[PDB]
Amino acid sequence: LVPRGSHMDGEKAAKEVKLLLLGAGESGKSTIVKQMKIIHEDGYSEDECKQYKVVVYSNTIQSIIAIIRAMGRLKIDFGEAARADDARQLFVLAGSAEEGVMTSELAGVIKRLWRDGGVQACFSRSREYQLNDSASYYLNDLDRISQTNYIPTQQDVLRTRVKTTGIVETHFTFKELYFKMFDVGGQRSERKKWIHCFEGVTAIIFCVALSDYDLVLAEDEEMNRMHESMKLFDSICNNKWFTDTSIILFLNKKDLFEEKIKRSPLTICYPEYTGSNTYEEAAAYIQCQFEDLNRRKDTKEVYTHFTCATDTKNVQFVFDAVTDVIIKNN
Amino acid sequence: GSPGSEVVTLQQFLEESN
Numbered sequence A: 001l002v003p004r005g006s007h008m009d010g011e012k013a014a015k016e017v018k019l020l021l022l023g024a025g026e027s028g029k030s031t032i033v034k035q036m037k038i039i040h041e042d043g044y045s046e047d048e049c050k051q052y053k054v055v056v057y058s059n060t061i062q063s064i065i066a067i068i069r070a071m072g073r074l075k076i077d078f079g080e081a082a083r084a085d086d087a088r089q090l091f092v093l094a095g096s097a098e099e100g101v102m103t104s105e106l107a108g109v110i111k112r113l114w115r116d117g118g119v120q121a122c123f124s125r126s127r128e129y130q131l132n133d134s135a136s137y138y139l140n141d142l143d144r145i146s147q148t149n150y151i152p153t154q155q156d157v158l159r160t161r162v163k164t165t166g167i168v169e170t171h172f173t174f175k176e177l178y179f180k181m182f183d184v185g186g187q188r189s190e191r192k193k194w195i196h197c198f199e200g201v202t203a204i205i206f207c208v209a210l211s212d213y214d215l216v217l218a219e220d221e222e223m224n225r226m227h228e229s230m231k232l233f234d235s236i237c238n239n240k241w242f243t244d245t246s247i248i249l250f251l252n253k254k255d256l257f258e259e260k261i262k263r264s265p266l267t268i269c270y271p272e273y274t275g276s277n278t279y280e281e282a283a284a285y286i287q288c289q290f291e292d293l294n295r296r297k298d299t300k301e302v303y304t305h306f307t308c309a310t311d312t313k314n315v316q317f318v319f320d321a322v323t324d325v326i327i328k329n330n
Numbered sequence B: 001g002s003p004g005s006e007v008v009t010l011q012q013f014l015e016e017s018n
């Protein structure tokens, strides 16, 4: 009979790191949450992935519907008039996948529409109706995702878009630190919940969609998307709650920005910009636009990283560096 | 600084916090 050892086995309580995820809608917060699960937890099991099949189908249907309606508003004709019929069927069958089953009929409708020349002409003008950035991801792999045996891959789950109406808390561990991450997905909640969420914050991660720079101003806006993000970052960085908080800036969607800057001038977003329409200089300009909004004491600087939130290796690298920063400032 | 149960926007909360 060997007496059992200690229950702590020589370990002790893990130090807590409270992270606040902030940023405009579609900036990459949910993707960062999922990447934290993939990198520092166990990823997504097969059952969890199965639970996202309905979301994948809904995202795909909603994306193609957005494109068709945008054709309506922009006066873009179908490449072939028969597609009109398909369009009608799309709206008739749009609720048929809510049980995680995409019939061959709906799959064929979506395939024919996505292949049409007018639909593609409208897609190339996505900046004019702010089409979500995962539409083509699913619509170009329709064949794979439309199989009766389809199970969403990890990358598939990463690209899904789900409602984030409140403040959601997730946990992980890394370098013996216990991370409590709070995604502020919504614009409203109870005052006491705001207080509980902003209390004792170790660090903020603020996500910015770079590729938002060329989005057309919609009727529900008073300024363009990038400037809404800048205003939010201003209100956060200079609030009493965060006078001494470590502020990290994820200038995200750098891949889409790299592709867009080739053909869309940054002056669409910043009319005063006189620099070149090239990746590095335009990226530096946006970075300075955001960093100049920090009016805290000089010791309180902003830690900026360029990210592709959907790229697991890049997020792993960037978060490895952010953890070192947090340990330093600890 | 009304009651803790009043649903409020992030902007309103940041404002009253300052």
Ligand SMILES: Nc1nc2c(ncn2[C@@H]2O[C@H](COP(=O)(O)OP(=O)(O)O)[C@@H](O)[C@H]2O)c(=O)[nH]1
Pocket: A023, A024, A025, A026, A027, A028, A029, A030, A031, A032, A132, A133, A134, A158, A159, A160, A161, A162, A164, A252, A253, A254, A255, A256, A307, A308, A309, A310, A311
């Ligand atoms: N190509 C690319 N797509 C991204 C990136 N970040 C996010 N996306 C996608 O853009 C959509 C919105 O991102 P999401 O995390 O939901 O933003 P949130 O509303 O702040 O939570 C999602 O479909 C993401 O998969 C990126 O860095 N590069």
